Design a protein around this motif. Structure first.
Motif, short mmCIF file in Angstrom:
data_model
loop_
_atom_site.label_atom_id
_atom_site.label_comp_id
_atom_site.label_asym_id
_atom_site.label_seq_id
_atom_site.Cartn_x
_atom_site.Cartn_y
_atom_site.Cartn_z
N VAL A 80 3.97 4.03 -5.60
CA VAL A 80 3.92 5.35 -6.14
C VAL A 80 5.09 6.45 -6.34
O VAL A 80 4.95 7.48 -6.85
CB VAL A 80 3.12 6.10 -4.88
N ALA A 81 6.21 5.53 -6.38
CA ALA A 81 7.29 6.41 -6.85
C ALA A 81 7.51 6.80 -8.06
O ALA A 81 7.16 6.06 -9.00
CB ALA A 81 8.65 5.53 -6.33
N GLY A 82 8.09 7.87 -8.35
CA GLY A 82 8.44 8.47 -9.73
C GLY A 82 7.16 8.65 -10.86
O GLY A 82 7.38 8.56 -11.92
N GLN A 83 6.05 8.58 -10.03
CA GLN A 83 4.74 8.69 -10.83
C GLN A 83 3.67 9.86 -10.21
O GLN A 83 3.76 9.80 -8.97
CB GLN A 83 4.15 7.38 -10.98
N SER A 84 3.16 10.36 -10.92
CA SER A 84 2.18 11.43 -10.32
C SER A 84 0.86 10.81 -9.74
O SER A 84 0.83 9.41 -10.14
CB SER A 84 1.69 12.42 -11.36
N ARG A 85 0.31 11.33 -9.01
CA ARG A 85 -0.75 10.56 -8.20
C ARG A 85 -1.77 10.08 -9.22
O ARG A 85 -2.37 8.84 -9.29
CB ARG A 85 -1.72 11.60 -7.18
N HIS A 120 7.32 12.10 -6.38
CA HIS A 120 7.20 12.64 -7.88
C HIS A 120 6.88 14.11 -7.63
O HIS A 120 6.27 14.20 -6.51
CB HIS A 120 6.22 11.90 -8.65
N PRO A 121 7.00 14.81 -8.18
CA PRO A 121 6.56 16.26 -8.01
C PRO A 121 5.09 16.51 -7.69
O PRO A 121 4.67 17.36 -6.97
CB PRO A 121 7.19 17.33 -9.15
N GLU A 122 4.40 15.63 -8.12
CA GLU A 122 2.89 15.60 -8.13
C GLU A 122 2.63 14.25 -7.74
O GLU A 122 1.25 13.62 -7.87
CB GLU A 122 2.25 16.15 -9.45
N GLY A 123 3.39 13.42 -6.98
CA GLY A 123 2.84 12.18 -6.37
C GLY A 123 2.87 11.78 -5.09
O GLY A 123 2.99 12.60 -4.16
N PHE A 124 2.55 10.55 -4.81
CA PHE A 124 2.46 10.36 -3.21
C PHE A 124 3.71 10.15 -2.66
O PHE A 124 4.65 10.01 -3.18
CB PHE A 124 1.50 9.24 -2.99
N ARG A 125 3.85 10.06 -1.32
CA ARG A 125 5.26 9.85 -0.61
C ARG A 125 5.18 8.90 0.29
O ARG A 125 6.05 8.03 0.35
CB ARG A 125 5.32 11.14 0.36
N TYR A 126 3.95 8.14 0.60
CA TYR A 126 3.69 7.07 1.30
C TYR A 126 2.90 5.94 1.08
O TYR A 126 1.84 6.25 0.13
CB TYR A 126 3.64 7.36 2.92
N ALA A 127 3.47 4.45 1.15
CA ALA A 127 2.32 3.54 0.77
C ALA A 127 1.03 3.72 1.33
O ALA A 127 -0.10 3.45 0.82
CB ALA A 127 3.02 2.36 1.05
N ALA A 128 0.89 4.17 2.50
CA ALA A 128 -0.40 4.37 3.27
C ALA A 128 -1.38 5.22 2.39
O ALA A 128 -2.28 4.98 2.56
CB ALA A 128 -0.11 4.93 4.70
#
Ligand SMILES: Cc1cc2nc3c(=O)[nH]c(=O)nc-3n(C[C@H](O)[C@H](O)[C@H](O)COP(=O)(O)OP(=O)(O)OC[C@H]3O[C@@H](n4cnc5c(N)ncnc54)[C@H](O)[C@@H]3O)c2cc1C
Length: 292
Positions: A80-85, A120-128
């Protein structure tokens, strides 16, 4: 072809390996040869590493489709890193739309030069969060796996916290997990018991990386936080300038590790090949397996 079902109905330990989508034709040519050689050992599934922050996502999709035509069962990695949801959900759909039934939900590392993760400013923060997304949108239509850290994730505040977060990730909907590479089986068995004590019952597969160069070992452990046994370290350092001696040392070490894991009844072993077949094939053959 869901890993969840492959594990439950297995006739013996599952063999699986990982590769990354190459960034050039020479890389692709080398990977094709590696896939051909390892396919002969009947892998239950094959992991496709996901480029950092989605940098090569189209390549992951391309290969997820390609290996199926080669008769291989894809485990598509997705971070999820560096990508928006939205971007994440899109690639996720392309995988499923391409026949992928197995996903490895990951967060991904921080950008290069950064030690603390920022999303990402509009992405997830955790794998969960990705595990939850996958379940909410596809249910049990796919099997999902996650990363486990026998020696603790570098960013965890404590090992207790590291385990709590892993359990939370499992609770989000994981069918299985694959561990970060380790070089002493005690690390793995210890994590397994810590997990069972914490109420985690999903299959946790050991991830193994047979060493082919001293630099490789040093760099990978330095970045992932894994440890190197003193004896192995001394041996590899002394013979570092001898590619053949190093390969032998690394293969024998991996054979010793894998032999004990199999006898201990692990459900399978996942090999980090770095797109090269020699080391893994040598480990399998020394364990007694022979190409189909
Ligand atoms: C088998 C395997 C395959 C991998 N494949 C890839 C790949 O294809 N591409 C790639 O870029 N990387 C890959 N990685 C690396 C991985 O993305 C990095 O280790 C990353 O830094 C952590 O990813 P994660 O999915 O384990 O994250 P998470 O489980 O989200 O953990 C990240 C950190 O957040 C903490 N944390 C989790 N939940 C919470 C919470 N609720 N509150 C506070 N803290 C929390 C954790 O304890 C941990 O320190 C792989 C690793 C393994 C072991």
């Amino acid at each position: 072809m869901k890993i969840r079902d492959l594990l439950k109905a297995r006739r013996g330990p599952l063999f699986s390996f990982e590769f990354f989508p190459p960034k050039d034709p020479e890389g692709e040519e080398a990977l094709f040869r590696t896939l051909e050689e390892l396919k002969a050992f009947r892998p239950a599934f094959v992991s496709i590493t996901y480029g950092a922050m989605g940098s090569t996502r189209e390549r992951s999709v391309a290969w997820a489709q390609r290996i199926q035509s080669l008769g291989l069962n894809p485990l598509a990695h997705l971070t999820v890193a560096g990508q928006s949801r939205k971007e994440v959900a899109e690639v996720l759909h392309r995988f499923v739309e391409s026949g992928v039934e197995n996903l490895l939900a990951l967060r991904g590392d921080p950008p290069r030069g950064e030690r603390v993760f920022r999303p990402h400013p509009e992405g997830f923060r955790y794998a969960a969060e990705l595990v939850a997304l996958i379940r909410e949108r596809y249910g049990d239509r796919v099997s999902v796996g996650g990363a486990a850290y026998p020696e603790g994730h570098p960013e965890s505040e404590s090992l207790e916290a590291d385990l709590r977060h892993f359990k939370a990730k499992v609770e989000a909907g994981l069918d299985f997990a694959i561990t970060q590479l380790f070089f002493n089986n005690a690390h793995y068995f210890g994590f397994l018991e810590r997990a069972r004590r914490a109420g985690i019952g999903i299959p946790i597969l050991p991830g193994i990386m047979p060493v082919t160069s001293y630099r490789q070992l040093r760099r990978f452990t330095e970045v992932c936080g894994a440890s190197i046994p003193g004896p192995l370290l001394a041996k590899l350092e002394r013979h570092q300038d001898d590619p053949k001696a190093v390969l032998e040392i690394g293969v024998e070490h991996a054979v010793r590790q894998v032999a004990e894991l199999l006898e201990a009844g692990v459900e399978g072993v996942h090999f980090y090949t770095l797109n090269k077949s020699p080391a893994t094939r040598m480990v399998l053959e020394r364990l007694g397996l022979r190409p189909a």
